[PDB]
């Protein structure tokens, strides 16, 4: 994501966030090279 990867920490379980966000709309893209299925 950064270049080759991202390199972030691995969380076991934590309380920085306890509740799920308002993000209801969820539909994953697929390929993104030809087209991402979603354009913008």
């Amino acid at each position: 994501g950064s270049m080759e990867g991202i390199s972030i920490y691995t969380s076991d379980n934590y309380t920085e966030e306890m509740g799920s966000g308002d993000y209801d709309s969820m539909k994953e893209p697929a390929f993104r090279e030809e087209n991402a299925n979603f354009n913008k």
């Binding site: 080759e4 969380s11 509740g19």
Partner: protein, 70 residues
């Protein structure tokens, strides 16, 4: 003073934002919870919000492998 017990809960997020752009997140964490699922956790740049990304996306795929390194 006091301090929240912490850790005592189930899942940080049960929902995922399936289409987060690497461009709108500054910091992630890989929530590989044995308690719930493999979760992708990110902090929005401009919004600063803690959100979760769906692990089946494309850029998260590269993130997954390299995030295991911390």
């Amino acid at each position: 003073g006091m301090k929240p017990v912490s850790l005592s809960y189930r899942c940080p997020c049960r929902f995922f934002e399936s289409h987060v752009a690497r461009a709108n997140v500054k910091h992630l964490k890989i929530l590989n919870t044995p308690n719930c699922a493999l979760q992708i956790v990110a902090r929005l740049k401009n919004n600063n919000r803690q959100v979760c990304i769906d692990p089946k996306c494309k850029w998260c795929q590269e993130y997954l492998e390299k995030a295991l390194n911390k």
